């Protein structure tokens, strides 16, 4: 049971700045040299990476602390407790530069006081695109965790989200937070089960908690050619882990992302990660888009932890 402090970070936004909310946690009675920064995907916020239902099972953040890593989870601008600007001011490039400012903040100690020797950047859905752009542009991270985002997507899956899209102003969870402009969307109540989790077995408590902790996105970001541009990923020169669910409705399918086997998936993605000194791949069985939220999520947590231990470590070991 971990020691945590929330803050806001001033971050570049258009001509001026905006506020990004984040939470820094350390394991209790320790001070790690590695911090893992986690970037959520579209229609999520920080809750995805620190899930408040059965956290000993579903909280990735908590698992990391328990493994001796420091963690920093953020609400992206437009979401959560962060600034909600006009949507025209937000795009992936802008958001990547904001993450770059968070990474620097963590390295220098401006965020969290201690300063961190190693910084791992972890992403999910379009969070992974932000993560990739950041690492590709600024080269100031020691490793990169890419989840739920491949270079081929399933257009029918994409289109299915759009069919279940709606303004946060007509959504019961988000109605009363802000008057959102026309560039914001979220998902229809009850739809996430299908369009994200592919109706695969999940705890009802998880589905409900996910629906209650959902959020808005700036939807034009999904159409940004940078999401799948090979120039972004091929330029990344630190260790990469790539994780994907074998029932992921947004990626997987005949002629799209190859979820037939872990090896086949690696073979298909490898050409896109040519500067990476290592490229690890995990294909999670019976899992849709949300890897943190599935019943067999521990397999994925364990593989991620093992990878971190192998490739950066946490700064508390005595090992060789």
Author numbering: 61 to 380
Anything the authors wrote about it?
StnA is an essential enzyme in the Streptonigrin biosynthesis pathway. The crystal structure shows that StnA has an α-helical cap domain positioned atop a common α/β hydrolase domain. The data clearly shows that Ser185-Asp308-His349 constitutes the catalytic triad of StnA.
The selenomethionine substituted StnA (SeMet-StnA) was crystallized in the space group C2 with four molecules per asymmetric unit. The structure of the enzyme was determined by single-wavelength anomalous dispersion (SAD) phasing method and refined to 2.71 Å with an Rfactor of 0.1923 and Rfree of 0.2196. The final model of StnA consists of residues 61–375 because of the poor electron density for the 60 residues at the N-terminal region. Residue Thr77 in each monomer is in the cis conformation. StnA is stabilized by two additional disulfide bonds of Cys61/Cys64 and Cys312/Cys319, which are located between β1 and β2 and between β7 and αD, respectively. The catalytic His349, located in the loop between β8 and helix αF, points towards the nucleophile, with its Nε2 atom at a distance of 3.2 Å from the Oγ atom of Ser185. The His349 Nδ1 atom forms a hydrogen bond/salt bridge with Oδ1 (3.2 Å) and Oδ2 (2.7 Å) of Asp308, located between strand β7 and helix αE. The overall structures of the free and complex are very similar with a RMSD of 0.232 Å over 316 Cα atoms.
